[PDB]
């Protein structure tokens, strides 16, 4: 288990970082959707 | 040892837990962007 916990705590330190790079990508792509949903807005403005 | 695994197999576990917690909202957001990439596309032929 010597031989396994250390196994293990290296596979935390992998899905830790992944996990928190799709925390920076999950903010971004909420971003992306904002000024993407005012630019559902003024192409119906000028439409109108 | 096993104190840290009893404790590490829970944590890796919940933590995994948490990234299909996001990774699904990767794609539920591309798939939000991407019915506005229909959307903005569609209307803006229709001004033309």
Redesign the interface.
């Known amino acids: 288990?010597?031989g396994?916990?250390e196994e293990?705590?290296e596979?935390?330190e992998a899905?830790?970082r992944?996990?928190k790079n799709?925390?920076d990508?999950?903010k971004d792509?909420?971003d992306?959707?904002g000024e993407?949903?005012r630019?559902?807005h003024e192409?119906?403005k000028?439409?109108k």
Chains 1, 2 share one sequence.
Do not use: D
Request: hydrophobic content about 45%; overall charge neutral; cysteine-free.
């Open positions: 288990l010597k396994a916990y293990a705590q596979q935390l899905v830790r992944e996990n799709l925390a990508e999950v792509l909420l992306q959707i993407g949903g630019n559902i192409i119906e000028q439409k």
